[PDB]
Design a protein around this ligand. Structure first.
Ligand SMILES: C[C@H](CCC(=O)NCC(=O)O)[C@H]1CC[C@H]2[C@@H]3[C@H](O)C[C@@H]4C[C@H](O)CC[C@]4(C)[C@H]3CC[C@]12C
Ligand SMILES: C[C@H](CCC(=O)NCC(=O)O)[C@H]1CC[C@H]2[C@@H]3[C@H](O)C[C@@H]4C[C@H](O)CC[C@]4(C)[C@H]3CC[C@]12C
Ligand SMILES: C[C@H](CCC(=O)NCC(=O)O)[C@H]1CC[C@H]2[C@@H]3[C@H](O)C[C@@H]4C[C@H](O)CC[C@]4(C)[C@H]3CC[C@]12C
Lengths: 504, 516, 514
């Protein structure tokens, strides 16, 4: 190892009296260096001193073996050993500082003038052998708990003295550094309990379902292909199909795939001597519950696209030539208002253009959409002309990155062309349901996906799934680019935000 | 020693896989004082305040017989001493007493759940993974277990609830009997506990009587001197009746044992079925004199419709009710005069009325107009006609917050009633409903002004007669605010009103009471 | 045979508590301090308390928490370490006369005691020392460290053994009274023999236990927090209502901004919006504004009453707007617009919902197009100090009124004059604010930790060194003064403020008058 101004720290010699058991580990784990997650960095000549290369906290998450073994235990104590590996030839200059931050330290930005005060080591970029460091366990309690995120001593590495090298015309230069770790000879678990599957250290996975069979979240119709292009606005404001990875729903996205673009309301029918009878709908949640205004722009499943739409609402007739019928009503959701539709307050109006006043009975009807007229990709009038709370627009994106859109086609009334519409969304419905049900634990920033074919095994492209619930690609073209609907998404690992993908 | 030993007792085999744990040898140099417990406490086993359980053939595998959290709440000596100190460490010894008959069969498991384990199901498949001990319901000698203390801090705090090692016992194999005749035995098991050799408190604090542990106690007064919680009259009888509906929705005399009040139960005893309002009078050549009431609470506060169905003390029955009111008259000679007004409950028209909306109508027959003035009055009941013990409408036809119906009950359990039937010749009622309630007003006041802390689910009470000093029965008091007892009869059963209720111990919901 | 004396000195018996002997095998380092701190008593940051005959038995005079915040040397040294273990000692002095009679108690409440209420019959059960008001010599007490964790953390307040004193016997004077005699009392503290920090750390300057300071700026060269004009007066007046509900110039001492207060001094009373214009048939040019934040960020309704910087006073406002025109002869013009904010109800005003309507009488027609513009106030008509129509006619979340002044206490006001449009009277209106600009600033730029309830200030001249008055600054961000007159009183503006210490809620100021 290396000399560091710190005292030896006791491990299991302190927690033995106050713990029921002390459990050993397989001895073949103390002899292997396994890469820690998020333990990679790349230094480039354009970087400036003071950039935080990486930081990570001591725990059972620094080793897949320990992270898996910590499901049937309760606590853990002890120190670990860490190895830093740098790639660089003998025509390089620069220096990097590696420190040992104490646990209870304020969270903020560290300038290069402050990082050196901690017990630290200084490493050149020309170093040949890997650099070894200890990672003790400084605490105030006898042992930690495996199901709680406590405070533990961290490791922070930041660039100290910048890099000076020449560069060819193709790949300028990148000094790559990687981190490995292993438990020391003083690591022990505490109490044996029956295994728990839904633990905190669970890698995120995705359902094995091809995109051709998914269900769109903005309109009840199957997905008919996915694509990416820069023509459309970079930051839309869709209120359906938004979800966090951790399992919290934003906007007005419903849990099931049948509530989309449909609403439940109590109806009141009153004949009007002009166009026809007029129905006023007081909205109510689909499951059946009082609707009160809040942070949601509308009741769950309400449409989030502007245009002219019609629905079927299971009419009833008290006249004697029949008892129950279904006929098409009329709805207006486009811009320019000219109506008194207040979904936020729970009040909608509908009408049918027909004479010979009908006989109707109010029957707390449902509603299912049929088709649209004049689709516009803007939000509708949630209030009269006021502002209502809503989800933030999708963004921001790294330069040269573009959103991936799942696309479907609508039914049209236009008398000019019948090509497409075509409605886009960020995620299909089953992904939303999966993320809502499982409720994973987000680790750092984002996931690295891979859209590989099932049979041949060749890889199509690499995409990044941000924590906010959208997928971005490193595309630098000019025209629309579609993709096949056969491959299966996979999860690679967590990556930092400032990660550069492979261009497609 | 004992008689024929065709039984098991060989407990011996504990062999629990756990290391010894240091007690007060750790917290000694981090506490400001020195303390010790009376050495005669460490010597004799005594019953825990939650040391009663019963195994019955109606149970199924997977039912949690009992659970215990390590602390001062497992010993009356330590429970009493916990009000004078702050913090505790150490282990305990627990004796479990099962003495089932020689005709029974079954097996139970005792586990040692570690701290921080999530609370919830704990099915039968998981209980054996912890360090566990097998037991038979036919063992003779008491079974001894150690209850150690596993922690990470030096000492816990007596106030609030920390996380410490638990003891959970669940029925593994169902209990059945081979007795040839007519019945299946129910095994009653007891618990005892004493501090280990290294128990100690930490810091001295003023003795505050209102402690988190404490122990629920009942007022020592006979039910015959109580006052009813639904009508201004004394309690006249104690009744059990299976014929009448067993899940009412009464809105008075309902109060949690931890202090919270539900429904429209007033704290005082004179607020029942009485209401204060602002009243405006007028004359109609039909009904006579009609008066509009806007109600407010009796103290003098304003009314705002909240999570309560009606102002506190409002009646919660149906029928025609006649009240006595005080009015001031303009004409000479008579200036103050008492009158008898009357109103019905359900007239349903565009006159609901809506006590939820603070609006009420009253009418009195009078051919000649009475010169009356606007005023503020208080109304107290005088007579009833056509009384139905069903919840009346409060709003127009909408839904209003309401207390949940009294329940649920175990099979064979019946709800006790503080009730009076006095036989009488009725005029218009074919279903004679007489006066009833669930608890008297004294109990409501006691529970509201004491604010106890519940422990598991319910209390075990015994109704002991005071003249001769023999028990009459035992009942289960659910901490939701009602009393139940086992009864499988057909007709009503009445009880004397000379006993005084006692409190024995806490108990879970699935306790099987003795028949009566 | 024995002898039991009837006069024994007061003492508190203690059992030694291990300090670094426990945290050594689980802390990275154990750092000692200068060995000449253990030999001197220093005033604590919270070291002021006062006893008055207005008090009643059973009142909590003061309470302190064991930690590095009880000594200026330790408060300074704590900026470069992480943990600490050990005990201290606290000395108490009272400035009592030979006429006042009374007794107080000092008790060492242990940690995790339910922080409810204490009666006079309970405080005496803890290890306690009984003090008389008439004592001359200071009295000292120890303060052990009773804990369950190995070593505390500086950045977390946590729970530690307290020291709370309370009035035992009511204070009474042989004089007829009621008088204004108050007994002052001060505290000092010093580390015991077993104190040391834990981990070494680069010295940060923005941390807890950092003494609050104020900018050295005379009020003449400051800026009003409710109008773009310099401060023109400093005054106190009891005729006006003593519980205003201004929505501007409100900031906590810690840095939490309350209401619609903007950080900069140039955002006040002015806003920015996307504006659409439309002509009429006699009304004139009617312009509809959708409000946005001054920096261009979108506005979303929330718990804030209105967009930042919106005016919160009733009346008719004349504003200046930059527009671009269509007809030839000119391109860009500046136009005067009218705005209605008071409870007129003859309009559709909802700054909460981000809709604003403005009008001008006419010039000729003046066809102008939509544009993103910024509105700055120019003139005011019909001033009434009442909250305007934030919603149409409904309610809106608002900052609470000031409160809760003790009896005999009033609020200090900073007075700034207006630009008035009037026909009858030539008097100039004035606006009172609780704090000026550069005082809402210098807050939310520093993470000050309150650590107590009230902060005691002091006003004095620069070149004369003469005290003018003492004022109490509450946590919520207003200045309280002890005045008992009838008419308004103004003060010279050339003085400067300076912090003194932290004082509890029940501190009694010194009466001022003329
Ligand atoms: C008459 C309709 C059923 C047929 C219909 O109109 N649509 C069915 C379809 O097309 O899927 C009735 C059947 C059950 C009714 C629902 C259920 O009773 C539950 C619920 C009850 C609330 O009071 C009103 C909404 C809500 C949600 C009701 C809306 C109307 C429903 C859906
Ligand atoms: C002068 C009247 C007495 C009227 C009276 O004799 N009423 C008898 C009756 O209600 O029948 C006084 C006696 C008690 C007073 C009330 C109590 O003293 C206090 C109460 C609460 C507030 O302090 C003020 C209102 C309110 C509600 C008081 C209103 C005026 C009352 C009602
Ligand atoms: C209010 C000011 C115009 C100022 C002016 O000419 N007269 C008003 C005054 O003097 O205050 C508006 C007009 C144009 C606006 C800009 C543009 O409309 C848009 C532009 C977008 C950038 O991303 C950031 C803001 C930025 C840069 C805007 C800042 C505010 C500006 C500069």
């Amino acid at each position: 190892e290396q000399a560091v101004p710190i005292q030896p720290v006791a491990g299991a010699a302190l927690a033995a009296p106050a713990a029921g058991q002390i459990n050993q580990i397989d001895p073949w784990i103390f002899q292997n260096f396994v890469q820690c997650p998020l333990g990679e960095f790349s230094i480039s000549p354009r970087n400036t001193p003071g950039e935080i290369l990486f930081d990570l906290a001591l725990g059972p998450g620094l080793n897949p073996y320990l992270a898996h073994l910590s499901a049937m235990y309760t606590g853990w104590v002890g120190n670990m050993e860490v190895q830093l590996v740098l790639a660089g030839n003998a025509f390089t200059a620069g220096k990097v500082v590696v420190a040992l931050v104490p646990p209870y330290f304020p969270k903020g930005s560290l300038t290069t003038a402050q990082i050196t005060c901690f017990p630290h080591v200084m490493c050149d970029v020309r170093t040949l052998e890997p650099i070894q460091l200890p990672l003790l366990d400084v605490r105030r309690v006898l042992w930690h708990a495996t199901q709680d995120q406590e405070e533990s001593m961290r490791l922070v590495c930041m660039l100290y003295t910048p890099l000076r090298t020449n560069s060819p015309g193709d790949e300028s230069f990148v000094v790559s550094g990687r981190l490995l770790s292993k438990p020391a000879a003083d690591f022990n678990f505490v109490y044996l309990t029956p295994p728990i599957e839904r633990t905190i250290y669970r890698m995120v996975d995705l359902p094995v379902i091809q995109p051709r069979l998914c269900t769109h979240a903005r309109w009840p119709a199957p997905v008919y292909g996915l694509l990416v292009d820069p023509s459309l606005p970079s930051n839309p404001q869709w209120q359906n199909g938004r979800v966090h990875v951790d399992g919290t729903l934003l906007g007005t996205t419903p849990i099931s795939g049948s509530w989309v673009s449909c609403f439940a309301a109590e109806a009141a029918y009153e004949f009007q001597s002009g166009t026809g009878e007029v129905a006023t709908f007081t909205l109510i949640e689909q499951d059946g519950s009082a609707y009160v205004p809040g942070d949601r722009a509308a009741p769950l499943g309400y449409p989030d696209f502007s245009g002219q739409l019609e629905i079927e609402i299971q009419t009833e007739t008290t006249k004697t030539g029949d008892k129950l019928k279904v006929t098409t009503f009329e709805m207006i959701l486009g811009p320019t208002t000219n109506a008194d539709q207040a979904p936020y307050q729970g009040r909608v109006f509908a009408s049918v253009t027909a004479a010979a006043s009908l006989d109707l009975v109010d029957g707390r009807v449902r509603a299912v959409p049929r088709s649209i007229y004049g689709f516009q990709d803007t939000i509708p009038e949630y209030n009269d002309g006021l502002l209502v709370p809503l989800a933030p627009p999708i963004g921001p994106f790294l330069p040269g990155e573009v959103l991936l859109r799942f696309r479907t086609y609508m039914r049209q009334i236009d008398t000019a062309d019948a090509a497409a519409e075509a409605i886009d969304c960020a995620l299909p419905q089953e992904f939303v349901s999966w993320f809502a049900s499982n409720a994973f634990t987000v680790q750092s920033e984002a996931l690295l996906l891979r859209y590989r074919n099932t049979l041949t095994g060749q890889l199509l492209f690499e995409c990044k799934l941000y924590n906010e619930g959208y997928i971005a690609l490193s595309y630098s073209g000019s025209g629309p680019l579609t993709f096949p609907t056969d491959g299966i998404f996979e999860v690679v690992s967590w990556v930092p935000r400032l990660y550069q993908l492979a261009s497609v």
